[PDB]
Structure formats: structure tokens, C-alpha cells
Design an enzyme around this catalytic site. Structure first.
Site, PDB file in Angstrom:
ATOM      1  N   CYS A  96       0.827  -1.202   0.000  1.00 48.83           N
ATOM      2  CA  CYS A  96       0.000   0.000   0.000  1.00 48.83           C
ATOM      3  C   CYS A  96       0.864   1.256   0.000  1.00 48.83           C
ATOM      4  O   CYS A  96       1.660   1.474   0.914  1.00 48.83           O
ATOM      5  CB  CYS A  96      -0.929   0.005   1.215  1.00 48.83           C
ATOM      6  SG  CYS A  96      -1.942   1.495   1.365  1.00 48.83           S
ATOM      7  N   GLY A  97       0.705   2.079  -1.032  1.00 52.71           N
ATOM      8  CA  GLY A  97       1.479   3.302  -1.133  1.00 52.71           C
ATOM      9  C   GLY A  97       1.209   4.255   0.014  1.00 52.71           C
ATOM     10  O   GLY A  97       2.104   4.553   0.808  1.00 52.71           O
ATOM     11  N   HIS A  98      -0.026   4.736   0.104  1.00 53.01           N
ATOM     12  CA  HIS A  98      -0.411   5.663   1.163  1.00 53.01           C
ATOM     13  C   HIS A  98       0.346   5.359   2.452  1.00 53.01           C
ATOM     14  O   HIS A  98       0.784   6.270   3.155  1.00 53.01           O
ATOM     15  CB  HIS A  98      -1.918   5.587   1.413  1.00 53.01           C
ATOM     16  CG  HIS A  98      -2.743   5.922   0.208  1.00 53.01           C
ATOM     17  ND1 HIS A  98      -4.048   5.504   0.050  1.00 53.01           N
ATOM     18  CD2 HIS A  98      -2.441   6.639  -0.899  1.00 53.01           C
ATOM     19  CE1 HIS A  98      -4.512   5.949  -1.103  1.00 53.01           C
ATOM     20  NE2 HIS A  98      -3.558   6.642  -1.698  1.00 53.01           N
TER      21      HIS A  98
END
Length: 120
Positions: free
Chosen positions: A36-38
Site C-alpha cells: 500500500c502506497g499511502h
């Protein structure tokens, strides 16, 4: 069983999630994903906040759980969107609502433990 990490954040697993949190007067769990980037942004915002609290008083230790490997735990907290933070009191989950910033997170967790004269 699991001891060998040099940091402030604690890694709780479905094997030692209810065994560690239950032994933590006040702990906060943050479900993150290694894809997950975020999260890549929260990582530092979480690990850091842990340093501020750990030094604060009372010291509020934080823990990071991987909803990817500990899915069992995620589903238990209806975790369907990371990052996902949640407060735990002697085995009592509470939808974490507040700022997701290093400072904020810390400031919040504080008011939670008991900003003023509380009971129970």
C-alpha cells in the site's frame, strides 16, 4: 517468543496480538500493507510518533500489524482500507479517529489515555 527488533513500534501478530495487546494498559494498532502506497507515508508518521509517546508520560507504546499476513486480525476489526489505526485498552478495540500525522497521532493518543481527571 518474538523478540529481536530495535525500534519503538511493536510488531503484533495473530499469534501474539491478543497476548501482547491484552498486556498493554493502552496500546494503538495500525494495520498497514507492504504494498500500500499511502502507507509508505504513514510508516514514518507512525514509527516517529511512537518515539514521542514512548518518551512521554504516561508512555503510550505503538504497534504495527500487517493486515496482509494477519488478515485474521484485520477482518476482526472490519479492516477494508489501509492505513487503519485502532486503539486497544486491556483488550478493548476502539475506532481510532483523529490526525494521521506524527504529531497529531501523538497528541490524540494522549487525550485518549486521559486528557484530564477521568474515572475507571
Amino acid at each position: 517468543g518474538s523478540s529481536g527488533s530495535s525500534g519503538v513500534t511493536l510488531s503484533l501478530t495473530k499469534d501474539n496480538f491478543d497476548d501482547v495487546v491484552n498486556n498493554a494498559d493502552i496500546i494503538l494498532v495500525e494495520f498497514y500493507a507492504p504494498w500500500c502506497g499511502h502507507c509508505k507515508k504513514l510508516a514514518p508518521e507512525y514509527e516517529k510518533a511512537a518515539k514521542e509517546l514512548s518518551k512521554r508520560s504516561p508512555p503510550i507504546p505503538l504497534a504495527k500489524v500487517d493486515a496482509t499476513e494477519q488478515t485474521d486480525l484485520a477482518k476482526r476489526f472490519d479492516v477494508s482500507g489501509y492505513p487503519t489505526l485502532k486503539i486497544f485498552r486491556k483488550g478493548r478495540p476502539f475506532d481510532y479517529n483523529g490526525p494521521r500525522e506524527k504529531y497529531g497521532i501523538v497528541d490524540y493518543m494522549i487525550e485518549q489515555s486521559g486528557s484530564g481527571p477521568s474515572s475507571g
